Amino acid sequence: KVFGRCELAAAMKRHGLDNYRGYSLGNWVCAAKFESNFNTQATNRNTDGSTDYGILQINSRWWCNDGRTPGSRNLCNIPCSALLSSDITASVNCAKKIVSDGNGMNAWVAWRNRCKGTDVQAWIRGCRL
Ligand SMILES: [Cl-]
Numbered sequence: 813k814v815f816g817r818c819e820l821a822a823a824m825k826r827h828g829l830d831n832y833r834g835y836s837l838g839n840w841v842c843a844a845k846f847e848s849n850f851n852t853q854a855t856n857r858n859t860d861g862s863t864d865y866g867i868l869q870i871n872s873r874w875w876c877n878d879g880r881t882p883g884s885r886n887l888c889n890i891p892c893s894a895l896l897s898s899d900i901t902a903s904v905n906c907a908k909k910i911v912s913d914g915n916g917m918n919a920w921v922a923w924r925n926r927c928k929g930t931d932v933q934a935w936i937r938g939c940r941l
Pocket residue numbers: 817845
């Protein structure tokens with residue numbers, strides 16, 4: 813599914829991401845725009861053989877099982893395919909674990925390079941939330 817901006821903001825708010833670990837909703841929407849262009853079916857392969865999955869491009873090196881990332885972990889206890897669902901619940905639940913892991917939203921390279929320190933409230937402007 814390709815989400816609309818306000819549609820995704822509403823779905824992330826319903827799932828408890830607004831101010832989760834102090835990150836306002838616009839941060840999460842900004843991260844999803846630049847990671848996946850709001851497409852739940854986004855995948856990208858990494859040089860190390862790991863793959864990033866879904867709207868927040870969660871990596872199989874640590875967070876999910878895809879059966880093709882040798883020596884990796886599965887810290888969210890999910891098949892990576894779960895992160896491509898039209899239902900964002902698995903993505904949001906795993907993202908909460910990642911953002912609690914010590915580096916906050918710096919875990920997401922697109923967030924650090926494209927959202928951090930910008931007017932992220934712009935991403936939820938105009939939305940009925
Ligand atoms: Cl947009």
